[PDB]
Paper text:
We further analyzed the crystal structures of MpPA14 in complex with three pentoses, l-arabinose, ribose, and 2-deoxy-ribose, as well as inositol, which has an unusual 6-carbon saccharide ring without an endocyclic oxygen. These four carbohydrates bound MpPA14 more weakly than glucose and mannose. Crystal structures showed that MpPA14 selects the pyranose form of pentoses for binding. As pentoses have a higher percentage of furanose present in the conformational equilibria than do hexoses, selectivity for the more thermodynamically stable pyranoses might contribute to the weaker affinity of pentoses toward the lectin. For instance, despite l-arabinose existing in solution predominantly in the pyranose form at 25°C (57% α-arabinopyranose versus 30.5% β-arabinopyranose), only the α-anomer complexes MpPA14 via its 1,2-diol. The same rationale can be used to explain the even weaker affinity of ribose and its derivative 2-deoxy ribose for MpPA14 (se Fig. S5B and C in the supplemental material).
MpPA14 (Marinomonas primoryensis PA14 domain) lectin is a domain of a 1.5-MDa adhesin responsible for a symbiotic bacterium-diatom interaction in Antarctica. Bioinformatic analyses indicated the presence of an ∼20-kDa domain near the C terminus of MpIBP that is a member of the PA14 family, which is a carbohydrate-binding lectin module widely distributed across several kingdoms of life. PA14 domains share a β-sandwich fold and the presence of two consecutive aspartate residues in a cis peptide linkage (DcisD). The DcisD motif coordinates a Ca2+ ion that is directly involved in binding polar vicinal hydroxyl groups of various carbohydrates.
Author numbering: 10 to 191
Amino acid sequence: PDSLFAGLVGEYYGTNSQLNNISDFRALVDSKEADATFEAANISYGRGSSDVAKGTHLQEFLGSDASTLSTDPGDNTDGGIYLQGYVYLEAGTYNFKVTADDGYEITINGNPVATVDNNQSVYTVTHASFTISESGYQAIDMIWWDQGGDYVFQPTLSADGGSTYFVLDSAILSSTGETPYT
Ligand SMILES: O[C@@H]1[C@H](O)[C@H](O)CO[C@H]1O
Ligand SMILES: [Ca+2]
Ligand SMILES: [Ca+2]
Ligand SMILES: [Ca+2]
Ligand SMILES: [Ca+2]
């Protein structure tokens, strides 16, 4: 049985190898069990300095979500997160606008909808629009990593053509696709 909560299933992975791109982080996820798990209920993390994978920087980064950490990871030089679950969206057009250091990839219903395939100091990209064909819980996943140094990750989503944006949080997230009453 998987727990039902108003959030995405979060996994954190650390490494002492360099993360240069999405492929490197995905390979890290493939390589071992998560160094920690958590509930991603308010997906607006950071900013901080001095490596997300060192000390208590991950806790600080995750903020409001860190109280659900399964463990306190040890130090690593590089690290990142893999989030998966569901997001309630009505049928229509949407686009992400994401602030991040380093890179990331967000997919909805298996298709990438926001990609930065490289390291970067903090930068905000307004991504291309995508459509949702049927109202309901949509499958969503995210990866994000830090190669070192500073770190931040705030995807925001617009339903109104880029006029307003919102953070993905417990209002609309579901870990399993069932309706959370938590
Ligand atoms: O956080 C930043 C970014 O990772 C950049 O790519 C290299 O410098 C680090 O300090
Ligand atoms: Ca794994
Ligand atoms: Ca730690
Ligand atoms: Ca590094
Ligand atoms: Ca960084």
